[PDB]
Design a protein around this ligand. Structure first.
Ligand SMILES: *[C@@H]1O[C@H](CO)[C@@H](O[C@@H]2O[C@H](CO)[C@@H](O)[C@H](O)[C@H]2NC(C)=O)[C@H](O)[C@H]1NC(C)=O
Ligand SMILES: *[C@@H]1O[C@H](CO)[C@@H](O)[C@H](O)[C@H]1NC(C)=O
Ligand SMILES: [Cu+2]
Ligand SMILES: [Cu+2]
Ligand SMILES: [Cu+2]
Ligand SMILES: [Cu+2]
Length: 494
């Protein structure tokens, strides 16, 4: 569907691994419908909130992950940063353009932990003059592969640490204690053809080590950014990351296991959990018998290079930028913290605070969780790891960033590091460093993409170009009324 479409947000009981539970779904499916368009399109995505189950929230808001939203900050999605939520029985039109981006993206609820309850799907923007197009034969709905964590317990009823119950690949998977006749996803190929696999993590938490028995890949895209082709045989993919990986169907006609091994919950592949099937045309309709061969060329982020020269902003030394924030990532008193502050949402969305006249840095709410950035400047952030519950994949809205230092990398790369929008911060001893330029007025979230951690405070808002935000982001009438509608709701109807 798309670029112009209604998207109904509904409650439905579903059982993707055989266990039935209530859910919040775009288009009544898990994952939601694939949204598509072409580079340069105007997306007009009319989100119709038909939710009735208070246990997963009747309100909603959708984030279109990876899009810059230049001049449409109001459409970015995060509840109480960029909008008040959409209220049940109402619609809201996300109306934005994608002039300068093409690649593999996704969308998800950005209200509390609601995307874990099912509101997530893939979003692909095709490039009619894609520089990589001659490297593959097939690129369509059938080559999108979503990796999802699935919980038997509703997000708002979770007790203690959330642990995914089942891995779902294209919405299908087996649970370790579930029916073994539960359907496995099948990726269909024909011998001799080449496939652009668009691998999308729609995870609320775990990372996945992705592989296909007896096959390898050339990575050609990273979080929307074209890369030099990189030959790999396994891909660790963190929450919200995307890769395009070209697969050549060059093995004998048969069935081959597709493997997505999570870092938490039940790991491995006993009984066909954490698995899907690559089936060549002409093979029996049956489960694979193939063996996981050792990974001789796993993806390492420092090996990724942009296809086109993307010069690193600033100078080639630590702190060689206009603005440095060495962010202190911590945990105390039951909450995650950035520079000592746990994010909790304000009653007035940050964008509305600014648009209504609050332009002094000290007055923006929540106090301690908003950092103003001046417009037209080079920025360096460090995200030194060690804090519990990792590895934490950090995400910056409104921007891509250069990963000048990856997890596990000591010496920064100021020449040709990859540019992306979700980065693994790693563990103790890592000091992930990212750079970008402030070219996009408005408030933009920076947070851990483990949704449980965002809920527990692991976020900060960058109010970029506060005094340019009003001129840059004219708002539509329906956005202007969201807070009035939402604040009028009874507490049981939120
Ligand atoms: C992560 O790297 C940054 C450099 O990019 C370190 O920042 C320096 O920290 C020291 C000690 O606090 C300061 O005296 C320097 O002024 C900082 N340099 C810059 C350029 O800002 C940071 O300490 C590193 N973090 C960890 C945990 O190793
Ligand atoms: C915006 O401009 C006003 C008026 O000059 C000033 O008081 C304020 O500090 C500016 N805000 C930021 C975040 O630069
Ligand atoms: Cu996201
Ligand atoms: Cu995002
Ligand atoms: Cu986290
Ligand atoms: Cu976000």
């Amino acid at each position: 569907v798309g670029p112009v479409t209604d998207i109904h947000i509904v409650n439905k009981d579903i059982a993707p691994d055989g266990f039935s539970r209530p859910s919040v779904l775009a288009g009544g499916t898990f994952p939601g419908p694939l949204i598509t368009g072409q580079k340069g399109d105007n997306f007009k995505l009319n989100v119709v909130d038909d939710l009735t189950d208070a246990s997963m929230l009747k309100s909603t808001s959708i984030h279109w992950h990876g899009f810059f939203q230049k001049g449409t900050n109001w459409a970015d999605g995060p509840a109480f940063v960029n909008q008040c939520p959409i209220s049940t029985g109402n619609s809201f039109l996300y109306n934005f353009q994608v002039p300068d981006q093409a690649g593999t993206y996704w969308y998800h609820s950005h209200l509390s932990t609601q995307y874990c309850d099912g509101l997530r799907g893939a979003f692909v923007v095709y490039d009619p003059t894609d520089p990589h197009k001659a490297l593959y034969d097939v690129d369509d709905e059938s080559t999108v592969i979503t990796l999802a964590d699935w919980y038997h317990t509703l997000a708002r009823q979770i007790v203690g640490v959330a642990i995914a119950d089942t891995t779902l690949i294209n919405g299908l998977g087996r649970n370790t204690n579930g029916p073994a006749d539960a359907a496995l996803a099948v990726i269909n190929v024909e011998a001799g053809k080449r496939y652009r696999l668009r691998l999308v993590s729609i995870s609320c938490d775990p990372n996945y080590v992705f592989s296909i028995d007896n096959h390898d890949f050339n990575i050609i895209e990273v979080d929307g950014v074209n890369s030099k082709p990189l030959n790999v045989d396994s891909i660790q993919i963190f929450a919200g990351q995307r890769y395009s990986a070209v697969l050549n169907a060059n093995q004998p006609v048969g069935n081959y296991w597709v493997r997505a091994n999570p870092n938490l919950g039940t790991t491995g592949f006993t009984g066909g959990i954490n698995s899907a099937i690559l089936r060549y045309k002409g093979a029996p309709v049956a489960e694979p018998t193939t063996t996981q061969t050792t990974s001789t060329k796993p993806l390492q982020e420092p090996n990724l290079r942009p296809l086109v020269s993307m010069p690193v902003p600033g100078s080639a030394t630590p702190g060689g930028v206009d603005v440095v924030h060495n962010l202190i990532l911590g945990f105390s008193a039951g909450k995650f913290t950035i520079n000592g502050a746990a994010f909790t949402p304000p009653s007035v969305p940050v964008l509305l605070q600014i648009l209504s006249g609050t332009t002094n840095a000290q007055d923006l709410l929540p106090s301690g969780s908003v950092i103003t950035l001046p417009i037209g400047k080079t920025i360096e952030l460090t995200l030194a790891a060690g804090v519990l519950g990792g590895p934490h994949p950090f995400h910056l809205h409104g921007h891509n960033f250069h990963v000048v230092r990856s997890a596990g990398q000591t010496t920064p790369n100021y020449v040709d590091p990859i540019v992306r929008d979700v980065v693994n911060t790693g563990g103790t001893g890592d000091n992930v460093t990212i750079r970008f330029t402030t070219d996009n007025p408005g408030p933009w979230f920076l947070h851990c993409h483990i949704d449980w951690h965002l809920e527990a405070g692991f976020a900060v808002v960058f109010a970029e170009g506060v005094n340019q935000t009003n001129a840059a982001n004219p708002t539509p009438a329906d956005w202007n009324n969201l807070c009035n509608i939402y604040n009028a709701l009874a507490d049981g109807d939120k």
